[PDB]
Design a protein around this ligand. Structure first.
Ligand SMILES: *[C@@H]1O[C@H](CO)[C@@H](O[C@H]2O[C@H](CO)[C@@H](O)[C@H](O)[C@H]2NC(C)=O)[C@H](O)[C@H]1NC(C)=O
Ligand SMILES: CC(=O)N[C@@H]1[C@@H](O)[C@H](O)[C@@H](CO)O[C@@H]1O
Ligand SMILES: CC(=O)N[C@@H]1[C@@H](O)[C@H](O)[C@@H](CO)O[C@@H]1O
Ligand SMILES: CC(=O)N[C@@H]1[C@@H](O)[C@H](O)[C@@H](CO)O[C@@H]1O
Ligand SMILES: CC(=O)N[C@@H]1[C@@H](O)[C@H](O)[C@@H](CO)O[C@H]1O
Ligand SMILES: *[C@@H]1O[C@H](CO)[C@@H](O)[C@H](O)[C@H]1NC(C)=O
Ligand SMILES: OC[C@H]1O[C@H](O)[C@@H](O)[C@@H](O)[C@@H]1O
Ligand SMILES: [Ca+2]
Ligand SMILES: [Ca+2]
Ligand SMILES: [Ca+2]
Ligand SMILES: [Ca+2]
Lengths: 99, 317, 315, 4, 99, 315, 313, 4
């Protein structure tokens, strides 16, 4: 085994390095899942707030000397927000990852 | 070289993962910051909700004094200092009304009418003339006709001295006065009445004015005693409706020598150019300008007969 | 062996290049997008705050003609629709009100009116009783014929009908050039001690008898619990609705954002949030309820009118 | 809109 | 650069062990080339004695009480000679080995 | 990474087996095979060594008839070919000699005779002068008529011809039923002091005038250097040949294994190694030379007669 | 699967090369032993080659004594002790010859002839009979006829007593003696001669023997004075050749009464059974058996007349 | 056999 020792162990040294990439990916999907539920509940909150504000600001017309007008826009954010959540491929989590 | 690549590949996949571990944090930071932004806006929303809850200030309404009286004079007699809008309640008046009080050297001139820029169509019906129309304001730079009924109540309450202030486009201000001015109740239409032309450098256009066109001009243009007439109510002493011809209620006789409710022609004086027909409807006062020179400003104010002027008559022997 | 590795490594480059760098990327965008949304908002607020250093003002003149009701004004020559002064009670000062002299024969005294979220309607009991908002704005000259958002005080409205029963008429317009009516031959609310309880009678019109028939799109008790007739006025700070009279959590006014004759909530909801553009979603509603200038009987629960108004007339 |  | 060089070692230290094992298998060639020629001579020397002894013993018929007798033949020897003589293929090798 | 190591392996797998493996076959077979050849040879020599514990003996009787020559014996009734006693010199004892009474008229005194390698001819000068070998063996009864291998001493032969010139006759037989002759009308060798120099004359026969004509299959000087006539006797330990008289390495007797009238070696070589079966190869010859019972003029250099003999007769 | 074997195959060739390198050491040892074997065998050759250089020992020749004399007697007088072959040289003898000496109580009997097993054809010519033939040996169990010339030389040298020892198949040994025995030289053929029958229990077959077949038998069979005759040389007193009839040289007269050179018939006695013709050639001695009884053994020895019980009567 |  003069020269089988090194090789074969350098081989069981790749897995000890790749199987970790797994324990790492798992962690990454731990945070990604939680980070998904937060964006979930921030896109909702911010949306509500914006209409709450569009509704209030409009009130100023009959209250202030000068009145501008806040303009809404795209819901294109609701599409994107959808992938970011719907694309829940985040769950993903192997098992042999463990010993 | 795969055995050798399956390595470099992993050396790379490790480098990436680590960055992914950074990018994941950069997102949480990014999220926390935002979640704070939402708070800051939460606060701003309640803040703005409050600031924008108050309604505009109705300045005009804010310049209507709380002082009152039989007329504008009593108003002065009650503290009224500056000229403006006030509520006054003549005797038989059932509901006090808003009027523009002109206050001079301690006198409460209660304005009956005013012409200012032909922005108010004066071609109104009877009921419209008895109720009033036009606009009041804090400065008397608005046109209107207080109302025949009020004017009646107001004048039959005491003895009033009517004053007429005319103004030409060259901006000249002459005036005419009439004592004991008043109007009979709607029963007898709203007949004009006064004792006499008290004074004035504007000329007595009411007792009539000779035109030379006919034998009875001063009689065909005497307003004293004339009933009130409007476009749809002919009460004049003329086969036709002088009220409908000039198109504006007024005390019509064989038409007029003094018509302050006439159509407001801008510029110097309107004309009969390109004779489409006679009609000298405009705002005129013969005794101070041809019946073809519509005035720029106009105002008919009332003041208690019991006021004015001075004396100094010493004993003498 | 070797392929045993070529396997493990294979299924990882995947997740790392897609499943993660994918979520990772299209996430830093949403978070980034959200931020910019907030700035546009924060700026829009700072701008309005700045422009509120000074309040607004209406310097418009005042019509000489007047009366008790607007009807009375009509009878007196007031034929244009604009701000007038009326005095129905001789022991009470005359007050500015917007008269509608054009619609359904004119003589209509506007008691409530929506047309641009220029006024906040989420006001307490004291405020709804006293009145709030702007009757009208300067048309440029100095004639206030541009109706504003306001609620002539409930107490005034009450006195108005106590002196002698009125007939009410609701005029609403959608954000699409359409407009309906809904008037009741008899309108009258009891005194404050009775929560200004509403009492209408005899519907007619094309908007939908929301007041005494509830939202027809509801069946059974659901429908009946949206009938406003006979209900008491309820506000931000005063629950008098027919929704769990003991549970303070069941407040038709808290959610639904308006002082109104809420009855287990509503069929009609003028006085609600002024959503722009008509449609709005449960997701946008402050309490997930159908707050907004609603008149179910016409556009259902999730459509806010562009124009809404309550008008009174005697006979 | 009614309630539960 | 972890297993990278570690592995890159178990290769250079295997790129030599092959050139090394080439030597042996090249040395056993020179050896077998000789062992081949020695057997080529021994096989010759043995055949010589074979005939000398043959000639000699016959001398005893006329010198001893009892006479023996002696055999002689086989090509399985004159063949397996040229066989082991031609398997000089113990000469093959490789010229690429050189740096 | 997948070639050179597993590509040069499809050729390093050519040495180790396809080539260097099929070699250690004969390599090891031959060696064990030789250990056998030698195993059964050390046996042969060690066996005969035993059988030679006792020498052989001829107990055969002796013919009453006798004479000087065998010719003389013939004249006296000795007509059978067998061992007789003769006495050519009255001052020398009679000696046993094998007479040939059948061939070419009989009366032939055999002086040399090959017929089975029963006697060693690789003998020194003293031995060839004195004589050696067995004249004849017991035919079973007790009559020695079975000729053996011997060389009646040269000195005797010399005296034989000195008394009065003889005629020699060579009788040889191949290993195939064929037989030739070769006789010279005059035979005579000088005394020892002269190396018993040979002197023959007048050839005739069918074997080939090898003595004074050399091997005819040789041309020029090569031929002449195989002529025995006039040559001197040379032995194992006494070079008198005509081959580099100074160089002791050039010894026709050392190689060629016999005492003979070698002249730069030979055409005829009776007295040489008795190869069995006739043919022999340079590879077998002790010195790579044509040693053996040769008579080139008949079978060339590499064929050893089955029978060879020298015979003398007077006239 | 790629570089996986690229590491194991090494273990193989790096292994086989040690098994391949194990047999190489195995061969050099097998070959080395052989070099030794070949040597230990290259010496055994040099040995056996020497041991087999010596010829056979000619024992017969080794039993020929170095002692000599006029005849066998002188030989005894010179040391001859045991019976065997010796060289003797009669007076006029030009070349001493080998003869078988029989030595008794101090007497040198020099044997002239002997019959033993009919293994020697006695039908020989004249020259053959005068030169001699047959075989001599260390024991006198071989047949021969010394030679008429020698016999002449030997006998004319002194006075010899001839003795004849016959032996029948029943193995009986009787003898006959004749004094002054001798033969005349070839000049007068080889005539027989003696003084008289000295003694013997075998009978005087020489002076003749009566057969009763004719009137002159003892005369027709008297050998005394008879010349020597052989198959091709008729010297008898008979129209024909008694020598050629019996086929064997001898002193023929009207044939014979004593013929010791006759044909050797094995078994008891030959016969004329189925008469093909007479001929009584066989080895006979009338005075001791019919002419039809060939003897088994025979010997004619000579001894100097001057010997023995000469003075004892 | 002769010699060279
Ligand atoms: C004894 O010797 C003689 C020869 O001398 C043999 O006989 C041959 O001689 C006969 C006698 O004259 C002849 O008749 C024959 O022709 C002759 N035969 C031949 C073949 O030559 C005789 O056979 C001998 N006896 C024995 C027993 O051998
Ligand atoms: C039968 C009917 O119209 N009643 C409805 C019911 O359908 C609905 O699921 C429920 C939701 O709160 O409200 C009422 O119970
Ligand atoms: C989904 C549906 O239409 N069913 C409704 C349910 O939502 C509601 O909660 C219930 C009243 O409590 O009425 C019906 O069951
Ligand atoms: C005459 C002649 O050609 N010489 C021969 C030659 O042919 C031969 O090859 C050589 C080897 O035996 O011997 C002699 O030199
Ligand atoms: C609605 C209405 O009555 N309009 C009339 C119009 O016909 C007429 O042109 C104008 C002036 O005479 O007076 C007014
Ligand atoms: C003046 O008013 C009358 C209506 O009373 C109308 O007929 C006429 O068109 C008006 N004139 C102008 C210039 O608007
Ligand atoms: O002299 C020429 C030379 O030629 C060859 O090399 C061989 O045959 C030698 O034996 C010979 O001597
Ligand atoms: Ca008239
Ligand atoms: Ca409730
Ligand atoms: Ca020499
Ligand atoms: Ca005769």
């Amino acid at each position: 085994n003069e020269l089988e020792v090194r090789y074969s162990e350098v081989l069981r040294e790749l897995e000890r390095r790749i199987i970790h990439l797994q324990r790492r990916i798992n962690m990454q999907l731990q945070q990604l899942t939680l980070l998904q539920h937060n964006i979930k509940t921030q896109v909702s909150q911010i949306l509500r707030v914006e209409v709450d504000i569009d509704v209030a600001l409009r009130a100023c017309k009959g209250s202030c000397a000068r009145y501008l007008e806040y303009r809404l826009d795209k819901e294109k954010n609701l599409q994107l927000e959808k992938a970011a959540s719907y694309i829940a491929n985040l769950k993903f989590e192997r098992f042999e990852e463990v010993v | 070289k795969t055995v050798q690549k399956i390595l470099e590949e992993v050396r790379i996949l490790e480098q990436i993962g680590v960055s992914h571990d950074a990018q994941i944090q950069e997102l949480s930071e990014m999220w926390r910051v935002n979640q704070q932004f939402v708070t800051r806006l939460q606060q701003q929303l309640v803040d703005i909700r409050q600031t924008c809850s108050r309604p505009c200030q109705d300045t005009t309404a804010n310049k209507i004094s709380p002082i009152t009286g039989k007329d504008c004079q009593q108003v002065v007699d009650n503290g009224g200092k500056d000229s403006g809008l006030y509520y006054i309640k003549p005797l038989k008046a059932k509901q006090p009304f808003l009027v523009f009080c002109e206050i001079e050297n301690g006198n409460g001139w209660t304005v009956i009418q005013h012409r200012h820029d032909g922005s108010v169509n004066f071609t109104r019906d009877w009921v419209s003339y008895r109720e009033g129309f036009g606009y009041l304001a804090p400065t008397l730079t608005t046109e209107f006709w207080l109302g025949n009924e009020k004017i009646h109540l107001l004048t039959g309450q005491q003895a009033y001295r009517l004053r007429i202030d005319l103004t030409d486009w060259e901006n000249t201000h002459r005036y005419a006065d009439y004592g004991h001015f008043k109007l009979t109740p709607e029963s007898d239409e709203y007949r004009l009445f006064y004792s006499m032309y008290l004074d004035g450098d504007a000329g007595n256009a009411f007792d009539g004015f000779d035109f030379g066109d006919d034998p009875q001009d001063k009689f065909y243009t005497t307003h004293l005693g004339m009933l009130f007439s409007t476009p749809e109510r002919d009460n004049d002493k003329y086969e036709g409706s002088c009220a409908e011809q000039d198109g504006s209620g007024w005390w019509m006789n064989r038409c007029h020598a003094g018509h302050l409710n006439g159509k407001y022609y801008f510029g110097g004086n309107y004309r009969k150019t390109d004779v489409e027909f006679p009609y000298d409807d405009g705002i005129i006062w013969a005794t101070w300008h041809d019946r073809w020179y519509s005035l720029k400003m106009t105002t008919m104010k009332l003041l208690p007969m019991g006021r004015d002027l001075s004396g100094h008559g010493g004993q003498q022997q | 062996a070797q392929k045993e590795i070529e396997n493990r490594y294979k299924e990882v480059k995947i997740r790392i290049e897609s499943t993660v760098a994918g979520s990772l990327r299209s996430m830093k965008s949403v978070l980034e997008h959200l931020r910019a949304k907030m700035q546009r908002m924060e700026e829009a607020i700072k701008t309005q705050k700045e422009l509120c250093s000074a309040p607004c003002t209406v310097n418009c003149r005042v019509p000489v003609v007047s009366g008790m009701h607007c009807e009375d004004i009509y009878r007196n020559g007031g034929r244009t629709s604009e701000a007038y002064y009326i005095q129905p009670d001789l022991f009470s000062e005359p007050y500015k009100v917007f008269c509608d002299m054009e619609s359904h024969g004119g003589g209509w005294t506007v008691v409530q009116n929506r047309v641009d979220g220029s006024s906040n309607f989420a006001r307490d009991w004291n405020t709804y009783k006293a009145e709030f908002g702007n009757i009208a704005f300067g048309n440029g000259k100095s004639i206030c014929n541009i109706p504003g958002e306001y609620w002539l005080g409930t107490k005034t409205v009450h006195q108005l009908t106590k002196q002698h029963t009125q007939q009410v008429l609701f005029d609403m317009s959608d954000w699409e050039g359409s407009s309906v009516y809904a008037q009741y031959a008899s309108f009258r609310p009891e005194n404050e001690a009775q929560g200004y309880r509403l009492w209408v009678e005899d519907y007619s019109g094309n908007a939908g008898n929301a007041l005494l028939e509830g939202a027809t799109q509801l069946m059974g008790d659901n429908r009946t619990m949206t009938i406003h007739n006979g209900m008491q006025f309820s506000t931000f700070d005063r629950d008098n609705d027919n929704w769990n009279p003991g549970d303070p959590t069941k407040h038709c006014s808290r959610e639904d954002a308006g002082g109104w004759w809420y009855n287990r909530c509503h069929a009609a909801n003028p006085n609600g949030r002024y959503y722009w553009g008509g449609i709005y979603t449960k997701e946008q509603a402050d309490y997930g309820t159908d707050d907004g200038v609603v008149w179910m009987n016409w556009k259902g629960s999730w459509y806010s009118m562009r124009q809404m108004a309550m008008k009174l007339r005697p006979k | 809109g009614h309630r539960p």
